[PDB]
Design a protein around this ligand. Structure first.
Ligand SMILES: Nc1nc2c(ncn2[C@@H]2O[C@H](COP(=O)(O)OP(=O)(O)O)[C@@H](O)[C@H]2O)c(=O)[nH]1
Ligand SMILES: Nc1nc2c(ncn2[C@@H]2O[C@H](COP(=O)(O)OP(=O)(O)O)[C@@H](O)[C@H]2O)c(=O)[nH]1
Ligand SMILES: O=P(O)(O)OC[C@H]1O[C@@H](n2cnc3c(OP(=O)(O)O)ncnc32)C[C@@H]1O
Ligand SMILES: O=P(O)(O)OC[C@H]1O[C@@H](n2cnc3c(OP(=O)(O)O)ncnc32)C[C@@H]1O
Ligand SMILES: [Mg+2]
Ligand SMILES: [Mg+2]
Lengths: 431, 431
């Protein structure tokens, strides 16, 4: 009553695609506000309600709940074209009146077309310049955040004020990018013209984000849900740098992205996949490039929704999870895709790393080290049974319950949800 | 006992130079750990203990307490040369054995010489390109953070591993900068050579920051103090963008800068100056370019310690303070430099802003708007008496106590400390 209402947070605990869209969708059913705080459409969150499947990127996953307000915080980077393309793609799937329940923070930054093109150029250069790049989503997230830090970028509020001033600063930002890559095209007037349209198409949804969240956390009690993007080990500060995204996907990102103090943050849920996946380049200790990897990849559908690029798969890894927790302080976990392991006789789990026959004392800041470590595994018996229909703790067979406990025990955090299917109702609440 | 010990935070509530060094120094007397989480030596924190005066920038202000450990978190950007220059400058003032009680996070980023040069180049360009720049400290903070977001920058851990790999990536980062400014010099081998020295000179102090803080917050109880840098309205997200510094000086920055969850954050103190100051370019609603401004400037010594560049001065402004609080959620305040107002018959205080004869509902995200607003002032009687020797609430005269209450009341936060002198003992604890 003194500090106001506290928000619930959902964050990825590994390298992304843990099932944030799913957990958020489940928790948004009775939420008054659902929001994104960092990242851009580099994120891809799948939701399955009824027989309908959605894949949001910029839209909060709660856009589905017509009785709730979806909010895009100041920490997010918005690419207007992608935003609308996404919305329409979903409008055709039944999404209606979204614009009436979507609010955009006027302090959020703009991803411009050249930011996306430059993202691609930087990757091609890194590839032909040293044999390997980052494995970026090519959405210009990195370039946009780079402009944000430089204070050269433009924001939502800039786009809605004097368009002439916006146009001038835009042109400068554009030319500055052609200095980095003189072959970059950039149809200044074309883009500039399209942007003018987006300004008016987006004007009625924009608002002051700070005042909006403050009012909501200190006005009559409200249920505010924060949908994280990307994941812990992809964090610009704490991830396997430089093979990371360019924002803080960890808990701190909720504060800096929505302008809310730590006391207004409550439950922080860590979405943990029963096994590990990585989309781009970089160290992956428990990576399984083999029969096992193909099975996880296959039974798990580990590939990009559009591009269809398959994701690297590997055994569960506790080193990254324990590390993720040290930074995020999860209050509970959502262990997902347990059903994928239904067919295994034995499941291995990475518990620690050894470099020179010696167990590293902690997760390496230098990603290059991880490439050299040897995983120390623990083999666990499989429950070899179909759990896709499990709806209660007791429904799960012995070996499966054991697997859940294994995770809680070695992370020191309790599992509150167990996923056994992509649809909303395919979950089990432990408490 | 479940979440571990909580840290105490000290943040600036205006546009910097509120007296963080002073408040932190006072609170570090019984602290086990004192640390910086964001910023670089763009910060300047003055401390006065006994008859000795210090001005730290990269070193936490608690470096003075030989029985405490000073820690530089992952969110900070370190310029090795400046670090040592600073330390030596203080060694000559009695600072001894600092290196034995200073710990550096291996995930912190490096400010390279060319980052500083580029910072200057970007400012000269902005000046001769459009009549005005940012008023940067010219420490390359912006450029370094720009590289961090791009993932092209190098970190402490990179500098301590394979120097050949570091040298190669360094060269690339350097050339990338000459593409932005082809006239940039850059003595690749020279700097590269100096850096090799710093690596070994700094090796014994570096450690894994995440494990270091986690151990401290969950091991036996400890008193951890976090020294903020810059200030709320200078925040890259919530400040008067683009006339801001390039990191989150607000509360969220503690989490992203030290890798600690919100539940481990406790008391968050807002250092509030009795009047307002701004070092660089940008809107300043209550700015007083006159006799009053000169007096505040004069009695307050509002100028850079080295460069001697005077700071813009103005009346206290509640709009920015209330806004700062919405984002930081201060638990208490430290109202400083009250003694500067000792000689005024009446003191004005900005309470709200009017644009078209109408009171704005909230702090403008667009800094350009602020330039157009008209401040609505409230005049208060001065206590016209010397308070430099006040040590208790009762010591302060009627009008002065009233001024303190005015601040608490219009901010909804209580004042816990009142400053009446730059030295440590020149403070008054209200509770
Ligand atoms: N079989 C199965 N699929 C799941 C489960 N949880 C989530 N999924 C699917 O796993 C995928 C995870 O990808 P994604 O949506 O990118 O996750 P996010 O990025 O964390 O939101 C989605 O296609 C989900 O539908 C589960 O418990 N079982
Ligand atoms: N007279 C007076 N000076 C003060 C008081 N509090 C702080 N100072 C001085 O005000 C100045 C503030 O500048 P600075 O050290 O940059 O503050 P910081 O950046 O917030 O640490 C310092 O020179 C302090 O010594 C006070 O209550 N009275
Ligand atoms: O494009 P980028 O600059 O962020 O790429 C840099 C690296 O970041 C990785 N990436 C970025 N966002 C996500 C993602 O978010 P999700 O779907 O919300 O969980 N899920 C999985 N991988 C992701 C891919 C690159 O290695
Ligand atoms: O150099 P820069 O890029 O950060 O400059 C950008 C703007 O940031 C302002 N600046 C930066 N740091 C500080 C500061 O920190 P302190 O002493 O810890 O309170 N105190 C006062 N002004 C400051 C000056 C520029 O307008
Ligand atoms: Mg995804
Ligand atoms: Mg200062």
């Amino acid at each position: 009553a003194a500090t106001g209402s506290r928000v619930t947070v959902v964050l990825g605990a590994q390298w992304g695609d843990e099932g944030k869209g799913k957990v958020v969708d489940l928790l948004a059913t009775d939420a008054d506000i659902v929001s994104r705080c960092q990242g851009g459409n580099n994120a891809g969150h799948t939701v399955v309600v009824d027989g309908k499947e959605y894949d949001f990127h910029l839209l909060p996953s709660g856009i589905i709940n017509t009785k709730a307000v979806s909010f895009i915080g100041n920490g997010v980077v918005i690419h207007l074209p992608g935003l609308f393309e996404e919305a329409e793609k979903n409008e055709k799937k039944g999404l209606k009146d979204w614009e009436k329940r979507l609010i955009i923070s006027d302090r959020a930054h703009l991803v411009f077309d050249f930011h996306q093109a430059v993202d691609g150029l930087q990757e091609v250069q890194r590839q032909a310049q040293e044999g390997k790049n980052i494995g970026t989503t090519k959405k210009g997230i990195g370039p946009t955040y780079s402009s944000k830090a430089a204070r050269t970028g433009l924001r939502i509020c800039d786009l809605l004020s004097d368009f002439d001033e916006f146009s001038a600063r835009f042109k400068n930002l554009a030319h500055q990018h052609q200095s980095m890559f003189p072959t970059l095209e950039i149809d200044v007037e074309g883009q500039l013209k399209r942007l003018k349209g987006f300004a008016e198409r987006i004007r009625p949804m924009v608002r002051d984000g700070v005042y909006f969240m403050y009012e909501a956390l200190h006005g009559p009690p409200k249920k505010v849900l924060v949908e994280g993007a990307n994941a812990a080990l992809l964090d610009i500060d704490f991830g396997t740098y430089p093979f990371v995204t360019s924002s803080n996907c960890t808990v701190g990102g909720v504060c800096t992205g929505l302008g809310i103090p730590p006391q207004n943050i409550g439950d922080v849920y860590g979405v943990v996949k029963a096994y590990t996946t990585r989309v781009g380049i970089g160290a992956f200790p428990t990576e399984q490039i083999n029969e096992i990897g193909d099975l996880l990849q296959n039974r798990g559908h580990e590939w990009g929704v559009t591009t269809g690029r398959k994701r690297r798969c590997g055994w569960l890894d506790l080193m990254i999870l324990r590390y993720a927790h040290m930074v995020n302080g999860f209050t509970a976990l959502a262990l997902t895709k347990l059903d994928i392991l239904d067919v295994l006789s034995e499941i291995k789990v990475g518990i620690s790393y050894k470099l020179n026959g010696k167990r590293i004392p902690y997760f390496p800041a230098n990603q290059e080290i991880l490439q050299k470590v040897e995983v120390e595994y623990e083999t666990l018996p499989g429950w070899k049974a179909d759990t896709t229909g499990a709806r209660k703790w007791e429904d799960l067979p012995p070996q499966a319950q054991s697997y859940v406990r294994f995770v809680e025990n070695h992370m020191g955090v309790a599992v509150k949800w167990v996923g056994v299917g992509k649809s909303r109702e395919s979950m089990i609440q432990l408490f």
